[PDB]
């Protein structure tokens, strides 16, 4: 029943605007886990479970998506302590986050960007089908299982229940945030998500994100700093349309010509990752 006897805690994996996350192994069966600790004092969004006991939204959102197998990180278990919640998450091994991966390798070949971006699209559709809006899609919140060639979306700490009405609150990453949030402090979930996917795709094919300053975010100009195919530039530009209603749906993204003939995850590992 207690947290300390049931998991062996190893080293810190990271910390920041997410918390303090340790590597661990579940003693029951030596399964690799990640043990995430969040201070109750630093949690602004709370939900309630089917159980009825009150939890941080992050927990609510992870249970809603941890249904079955996917490109979303699985919540295995959680615990309440006096001043915090501890979340036990899946840990792929070996793993690298997409931010370090792009730093190390630079601009990704399009074939590899295509397989990755496709898998991010499938994961975000999953969240949306489960009623969850992540709100912080970025390379930092994507893990790559280096052996399976599978991507996992992590860190739902800035997410919300998906709704069709307007959002007026946001605590995700500003350089992935859309221009309607910058200027008006309003967005709709899906269209904001697609903008952020546009940033992510540019990040993949160019080796860093397109915009750092507000004025660039609202300016509506995408300069390509790497050789990128016309079809890919068109997709990025569509995703980063200034008017939200001008952005593509997930379907339109996935039917885009640049998105056809995607590699399987195993093929991706074999060609690009071993």
């Amino acid at each position: 029943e207690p947290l300390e006897s049931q998991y062996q805690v190893g080293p810190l994996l990271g910390s920041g605007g997410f918390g303090s996350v340790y590597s661990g192994i579940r003693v029951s069966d030596n399964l690799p886990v990640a043990i995430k600790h969040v201070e109750k004092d630093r949690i602004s969004d709370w939900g309630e479970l089917p159980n009825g006991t009150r939890v941080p939204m992050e927990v609510v959102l992870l249970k809603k998506v941890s249904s079955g197998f996917s490109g979303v990180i699985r919540l295995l278990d959680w615990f309440e302590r006096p001043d915090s919640f501890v979340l036990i998450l899946e840990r792929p091994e070996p793993v690298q986050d997409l931010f370090d991966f792009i730093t190390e390798r630079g601009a990704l070949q399009e074939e590899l960007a295509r397989s990755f971006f496709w898998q991010v699209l499938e994961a975000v559709r999953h969240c949306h089908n489960c009623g969850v809006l992540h709100r912080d899609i970025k390379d930092e919140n994507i893990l790559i299982d280096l052996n399976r060639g599978e991507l996992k979306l992590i860190d739902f700490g800035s997410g919300a229940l998906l709704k069709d009405t307007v959002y007026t609150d946001f605590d995700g990453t500003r350089v992935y945030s859309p221009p309607e949030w910058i200027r008006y402090h309003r967005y709709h979930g899906r269209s904001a998500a697609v903008w952020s996917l546009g940033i992510l795709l540019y990040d993949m094919v160019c080796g860093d994100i397109p915009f750092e300053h507000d004025e660039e975010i609202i300016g509506g100009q995408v300069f390509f700093r790497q050789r990128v195919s016309s079809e890919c530039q068109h997709l990025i530009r569509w995703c980063l349309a200034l008017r939200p209603s001008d952005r593509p749906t997930f379907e339109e993204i996935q039917n885009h010509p640049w998105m056809q003939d995607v590699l399987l995850p195993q093929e991706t590992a074999e060609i690009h990752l071993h």
């Binding site: 605007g17 730093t103 930092e140």
Partner: peptide, 9 residues
Amino acid sequence: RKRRRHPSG
């Protein structure tokens, strides 16, 4: 040119 992480929170 400088590539960096960006905190959310």
